[PDB]
Amino acid sequence: ISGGDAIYSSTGRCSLGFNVRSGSTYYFLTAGHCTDGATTWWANSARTTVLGTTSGSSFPNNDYGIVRYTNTTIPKDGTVGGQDITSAANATVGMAVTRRGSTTGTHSGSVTALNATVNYGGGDVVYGMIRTNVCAEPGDSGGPLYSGTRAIGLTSGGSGNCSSGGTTFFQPVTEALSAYGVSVY
Ligand SMILES: N[C@@H](Cc1ccc(O)cc1)C(=O)O
Ligand SMILES: [Cl-]
Ligand SMILES: [Cl-]
Ligand SMILES: [Cl-]
Ligand SMILES: [Cl-]
């Protein structure tokens, strides 16, 4: 399993963001709105291949969370599909970026603003977000935003779709890495 692949909680489907670790303890990052209220995560819709257990969630304000792997045999590739990931970096305005998710696959675009605020309603306001003209659809949440070998963001939300076009906001991944003291590999 790698960044962008489907992940299933007790209630629905999101996307794996990045595989990360502290030492030989492996985890993955995803969206906080996906980890909120979740316990176990599975790799398949039939919920027979366990991945692991929710181990942190920050949503709203931020939108990141972390899952501790309990499945010792599944491959945990330090990649986003075929893209090798080696480090994390921060977005800049105008930067070419790529998202991968489990609903719509791989889509590219550009960063249009930094430090964006998104009000999802119901008190769920998030701050500090990377705004882009990349599209996304439900189920893509949590998936990676990257540029080359650099991990940049986690899919939070937005408007539109991949057929007609859209606007998507991403949580900076560096914040999540620092909050938990974990690293991409
Ligand atoms: N909110 C979706 C992600 C999303 C992104 C952009 C959109 O236009 C719509 C949905 C997730 O929880 O799975
Ligand atoms: Cl599904
Ligand atoms: Cl380490
Ligand atoms: Cl391993
Ligand atoms: Cl690179």
Curated annotation (Swiss-Prot):
It comes from the Bacteria. The chain holds residues 115 to 299 of 299 of the full protein. It catalyses: Hydrolysis of proteins with trypsin-like specificity. Has a primary specificity for large aliphatic or aromatic amino acids. It comes from Streptomyces griseus. This is Streptogrisin-B. One of its GO terms (molecular function) is serine-type endopeptidase activity. The active site is at 33 (charge relay system), 63 (charge relay system), 141 (charge relay system). Keywords: Disulfide bond, Hydrolase, Protease, Serine protease, Signal, Zymogen. Transmembrane segments: none annotated. Monomer. Its EC number is 3.4.21.81. The gene is sprB.
